[PDB]
Structure 1
Amino acid sequence: EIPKPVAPAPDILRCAYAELVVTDLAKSRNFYVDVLGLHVSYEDENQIYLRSFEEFIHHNLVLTKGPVAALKAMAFRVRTPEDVDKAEAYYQELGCRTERRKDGFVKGIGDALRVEDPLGFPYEFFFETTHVERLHMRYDLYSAGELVRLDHFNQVTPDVPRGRKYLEDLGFRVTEDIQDDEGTTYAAWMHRKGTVHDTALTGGNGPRLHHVAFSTHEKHNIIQICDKMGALRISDRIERGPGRHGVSNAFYLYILDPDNHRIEIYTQDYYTGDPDNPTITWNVHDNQRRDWWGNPVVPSWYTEASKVLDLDGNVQEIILRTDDSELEVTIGADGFSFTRAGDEDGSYHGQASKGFKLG
């Protein structure tokens, strides 16, 4: 019910960076630099610009000091300077608020368009960016937990099919989703760059930002992040994992930054770049869909997510999801999940797997 514009979609390459507003810049720096090992492209008393090991654009993450922690912008790189004009035309036809800045909104980005999209998310589209030293062979800097690439964003929105259509019109291709037999959709994953996703929609009250994900080379790198957090005695900031995903098949970990922005560490999903890439739909009650090993999904993973800002820097209104809740139908008092479809053995009723109930 979001209409398809007559205007052509901008050619989107990939997710490129997020700008997160943080309340204590020093504490945030400790987390992203000292704990996680991201590389400083620029910093001052107001902002920190960070990039992953293999990145050549200026940054994958901007930490901006502000009064209220929130997503300020989720930025996608487009293929040509002309695609920025295409983005402006497209969103204007959709009736969305847009703001164009020839000199960019943040350092290291040139001509850029920010929009309040039809789902209420602050999207940025840009082509021009300052190239920096690509650190991909700087093994003298490589940490045991090295984050090598920015992989994806994940957005919380109340109406998944509505957002899905809009993103498909924008050119994203759906790779996987979670539905039930009653026809409710709980989540969808969609890509531009030929991995499982560049962004994803998670059913819930929104707009809110669920997480930003970075890649590692190997599974042991993700294990090391966990181990380091234990050594630093901040294991309470490990939210969920590590595990193997069902959807995406990636090895994963979720952690919480000082403002409770959720960061995923992710590795080893599969190639999706063929236009007839087979879509995979999982049943919501399948206990292997989110954690392949059947480990329970922590309730905060379903309930907590970051505020997002509008173009004035104010927090966007949040709309209540009315479709069924994934938490409620799977691990809530009236929920259930299964290990084998139709088998009562290895099924869980009114609680989570592995012997746990909701706290």
Structure 2
Amino acid sequence: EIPKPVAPAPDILRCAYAELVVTDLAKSRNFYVDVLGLHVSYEDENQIYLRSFEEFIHHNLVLTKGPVAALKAMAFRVRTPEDVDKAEAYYQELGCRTERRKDGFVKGIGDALRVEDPLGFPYEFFFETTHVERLHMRYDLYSAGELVRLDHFNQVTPDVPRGRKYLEDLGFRVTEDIQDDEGTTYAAWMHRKGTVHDTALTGGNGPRLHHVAFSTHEKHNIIQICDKMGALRISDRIERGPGRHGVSNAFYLYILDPDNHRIEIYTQDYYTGDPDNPTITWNVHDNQRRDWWGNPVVPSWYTEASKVLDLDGNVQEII
């Protein structure tokens, strides 16, 4: 069991960006820029910084050339600069390794803290970031499958209850969960920003990053991504969907990048900001909890997930 610190939890606003290590920067760029249409905030020969259509912070996704494909950091923006200090004290009290860089770990981000959390994931907490042009009204750049915001991460861990209690201490609230008859949690969705989730815990060998998710405005935008991928003859990279999720009620699509990092395109969440928001508990045997339409969920979806790195860049041991 992970103890609850005496130190006050940092006030987390929302998931902000993920930093993924990719093996071939040009193939990855072709997938994220030419196929998916994300907007390049900055790039050089080692890294590409991308942002979604409505974002005003520097980026939502950093692709870093690296020898082994993996999740290098999942970042959450905190409410004030002092929350970075709170995060540092908080994770130190939990006995976790932390690394603080006043100048940031990646471009566009200022004072930041990366930690190897209790579940083995590399989390970053930061407030400062360079504001860039919000492209929300740049309809001259709007693509038929435009990704408008980064919505959430989904982590794979062996002990979901244990991770659940840890994130609830951190301030995340469960919006929906999957439980057995005994009341044991099998998976949980938790938020800070007011949508169904900023992150989620799914049971399995971990630590591993299951996917990063972006949303679109409407359902036809998701359908265009599938049509485009079939026209580019890469439909084999469509893993699951499109479909309607039971948990979260979102219309979804799961596709795979060149390094097999899973990306989810999502839309039509509901508001969960009130403090007594009614948690929705689905039974582990309910066939409509994952796919509302009852579609069989691909085997690989449960088995394949991305490796994550510790703070020295080594791959975390999978349990």
Pick the TM interval, shorter chain. over 0.9
Offset, 1:186: 1.8
Q: Secondary structure at the match of 1:213?
A: strand
Q: Deviations over 1:157-201 (max 9, x none)?
A: 000010000000000000001111144422100000000000000
Residue 298 of structure 1 and its aligned partner are, at CA, apart by 0.4
Does 2:93 align with 1:88?
no
- Deviation, 1:55, is 0.3
**Higher gyration radius (CA):** 1
The Cα shift of 1:115 comes to 0.2
Any idea what the Cα deviations from partners look like across 1:111-156, whole Å, max 9, x if unmatched? 0000000000000000000000000000000000000000000000
Give 1:284 deviation, angstroms: 1.3
Q: Normalising by the residue count of structure 1, what TM-score does the alignment of the two structures yield? A: 0.88
The Cα offsets for residues 77-127 of structure 1, whole Å up to 9 and x where unpaired, read as 000000000000000000000000000000000000000000000000000
Deviation at 1:56, TM superposition (A): 0.2
SS of the residue 2:103 aligns to: coil
1:132 match: 132
TM-score (norm 2): 0.99
Deviations 1:312-332 (A, max 9, x none): 00000111xxxxxxxxxxxxx
1:208-232 Cα shifts (integer Å, max 9, x gaps): 0000000000000000000000000
Question: Residue 241 of structure 1: CA displacement?
Answer: 0.1
In structure 2, the partner of 1:67 is 67
Q: Structure 1 vs Structure 2: percent identity of aligned residues?
A: 100
Q: Which stretches in structure 2 are left out of the alignment for 5+ residues?
A: none
**Aligned: 1:212 with 2:212:** yes
Dislocated runs of 4+, deviation >2 Å:
182-185
Q: Distance in 2 between matches of 1:175 and 1:71?
A: 25
Deviation at 1:32, TM superposition (A): 0.3
C-alpha distance in 2, partners of 1:81/1:284?
A: 41
SS of alignment partner, residue 190 of structure 1: strand
SS at match of 1:89: helix
Q: Which residue of structure 1 aligns with residue 55 of structure 2?
A: 55
Q: Hey, what's the Cα distance between the residues in 1 that align with 2:183 and 2:276?
A: 23
Deviation per CA, 1:23-54: give whole Å up to 9, x if none: 00000000000000000000010000000000
Q: Equivalents in 1 of 2:250, 2:273: separation in Å?
A: 17
1:219-258 alignment runs, 5 A limit: 219-258=219-258
Q: How many residues align?
A: 319
Residue 252 of structure 1 aligns to a residue whose secondary structure is strand
2-structure distance, mates of 1:182, 1:261: 34
CA distance in 2, matches of 1:52, 1:266: 13
Q: Distance in 1 between matches of 2:138 and 2:8?
A: 40
3-state SS in 2 of match to 1:243: strand
> Hey, what's the Cα distance between the residues in 2 that align with 1:85 and 1:209?
26
C-alpha RMSD over aligned residues:
0.5
- Deviation string 1:263-295 (CA, Å, 9 cap, x unpaired) is 000000100000000001101111111010000
More RCO (CA 8 Å, sep 6+): 2
Rounded Cα–Cα distance in structure 2 between residues aligned with 1:254 and 1:197: 17
Q: Measure the CA separation in 2 of the matches of 1:219 and 1:143.
A: 14
Shift of 1:11: 0.3
Question: How far 1:72 moved relative to its partner?
Answer: 0.1
The Cα shift of 1:262 comes to 0.1
Write out per-residue CA displacement over residues 4-23 of structure 1, whole angstroms, 9 at most, x where no aligned residue.
00000000000000000000
Structure 1 Cα separation of the partners of residues 79 and 18 of structure 2: 18
Deviations for 1:287-313, whole angstroms, at most 9, x for unmatched residues? 111010000110001001000000000
